[PDB]
Design a binder for this molecule. Structure first.
Ligand SMILES: [Mn+2]
Ligand SMILES: [Mn+2]
Ligand SMILES: [Mn+2]
Ligand SMILES: [Mn+2]
Lengths: 209, 211, 211, 209
């Protein structure tokens, strides 16, 4: 059936990411923002089914913005919750991703240099957007996307970090740098390791729900 | 069924727009460039029907560029043939559009002042694109689009001018100014007048000929 | 000398716009966000003076993003403080703009119909951006810009509304609709009336206070 | 002095690239299109000097489009002529670039696979633009730019291919695929080898003229 998406539950409690991410932000980010992206996606898919059947290409093009923005929001946030875990969990330990860290160290020199290069790209985003570590054929790359544009060009997304203001403003105010340093404590490196070992279809299996 | 578009024939012979536009360019623009947009549009639409049925959102988004580029190219060129006619034809006479030219004169002062602003936007396009005169809830307006992006935002397209290099290069070389000055001779004001009094759905009836 | 901008003070106290906009947001928006745009603008302008003197075209192009983002942020926010006033002030009364409201009513039918179209564009902005009412050679128009892109294309900006999340999130959370409905109470119609009768150079005199 | 650029002469004759590129196209591409980019660049730089002195930021932003478009056109075309040579020259032999081809073969598998991946990106450009082989920190990448956007983000440009319609239409008509296959005969691999061995400042030394 067309447009039958639903909001998946979190793999953890709303306060499980504290003190890195407050329980209020996790509640608003998931139950409000992410829910809205899922809802408007279903409506857009149902409206597109009408235009596609009638061969109304002007209406299909006019609907592309709503599908890209809302579909990407559901895609990016579905990835986001999976690659986040409480700091106490062993998944937050970079040692749980031995093959990923080896390629990371070969590319940027070390894990600390990659976190510096990753952090630099996140703080350099002008406006709303995301920062991603992706997998291209042979090596790795740091890429940024604006608003809710997803990584659907062929690359294998390893993990992403939301730099939208709704993700940190209630706790860090304008201090986005403090939000980046603290989010490294809640990065699920086990999820990042698995996605790095699978192909594109494997990473996009989180979309089942 | 989905993606069943075909190339519509021109309203005239390939040499009817000479000396403004050569017969070689008109044939290549129509039989080659426009045909490719029609063909690849059908392919993109058929692949999307699979993705929409399977609820494959990653595949649907990745196809948007192919649909917008090919669908817009088919739309813009389908408009293009309709709003062009030979200079000798009475449809190329601006007197065939009394309500449009009056509204133009109320907006820019006169038709020649409108031709000055329109030509400036066409020559100011950086790269591939189009120039259009549309009708909004405010009046008339000159808008430009990049590559093959169509005017599907709600405005009613009155007439457009293709500024792609494949539309003039074989005859005017890099002299796009000479291509703009001469294309004023073959502007179908009858089509522009008809579109100016109708709505979006009326103007977009030319797309049905492509089935 | 080049890059000598400073943050201009607000025309009121930080709590003068309550209850529409909280005092905490106004202080952060002004003393933190706007200050960063002013500071980083100066840095970008000083680096460009070196590149322009040395005729370093690669370095000049690479700096355009920093100049547009920081310069536009300083421009938009400088406009923002001027066209906002407390709801109790007589400047927030639409009767202080008889020529603007008459032109608005001729365009959208009434002021309330204009408020409906303006609010729709603000809530329809995907990501960070602004909404503006400008004055062209046609009349008035509602335009939106992304991130901190300013309205420097020729139009005369009448008034704008900041739709960045840092402008309302600490008080209205994700409820941007409530932020738009309440901001209508603090719109300085006196500033909008003054800008509506002047030209681009008159409206852009507020930037001189930043020296 | 501000805006004192001039059109550099070609390293070869107008018919030296035949039969790959006709003498008419080389004459129009260089003496007309490229000359226009240089001329409008100088004017834009002189107008910007006025705005920069008066601290007219709105005028500086409004001039960014003319500087990016015209400055990039002079930059891209200055690179283009240098990495082009007659087919008979030994510089058109890929064996004149042993270190570049070794990295090419390590990335895409072989030279023929890179030419296929490069050719695919060139024909996939929607509208006017360029295709480039660039050098990023450790490895190589195929990137495309629209219109006259230059590669000024930090990467080291190795060589580029113009996919603008003014570069091939007078000879290959709409057959851009035939234009891509034939341009491989006139690729100056010696120029590509040197740029790959130097840094960013070395590649942008061609701008001296
Ligand atoms: Mn988010
Ligand atoms: Mn065309
Ligand atoms: Mn703001
Ligand atoms: Mn070129």
């Amino acid at each position: 059936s067309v447009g039958t998406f639903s909001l998946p539950a979190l793999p953890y409690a709303y306060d499980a990411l504290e003190p890195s991410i407050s329980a209020q932000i996790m509640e608003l980010h998931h139950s409000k923002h992410h829910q809205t992206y899922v809802t408007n996606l279903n409506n857009a898919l149902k409206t597109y089914s009408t235009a596609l059947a009638a061969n109304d290409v002007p209406s299909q093009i006019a609907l592309q913005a709503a599908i890209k923005f809302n579909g990407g929001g559901h895609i990016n946030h579905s990835f986001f919750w999976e690659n986040l875990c409480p700091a106490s969990s062993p998944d937050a330990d970079p040692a749980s991703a031995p093959e990923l860290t080896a390629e990371i160290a070969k590319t940027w020199g070390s894990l600390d240099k990659f976190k510096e290069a990753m952090g630099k790209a996140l703080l350099g985003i002008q406006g709303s957007g995301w920062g991603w570590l992706v997998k291209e054929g042979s090596g790795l790359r740091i890429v940024t996307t604006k608003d809710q544009d997803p990584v659907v060009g062929g690359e294998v997304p390893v993990f992403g970090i939301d730099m939208w203001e709704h993700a940190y403003y209630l706790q860090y105010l304008n201090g986005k740098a403090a939000y980046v340093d603290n989010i490294w404590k809640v990065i699920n490196w086990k999820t990042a390791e698995q996605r790095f070992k699978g192909d594109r279809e494997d990473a996009f299996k989180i979309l089942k729900a």
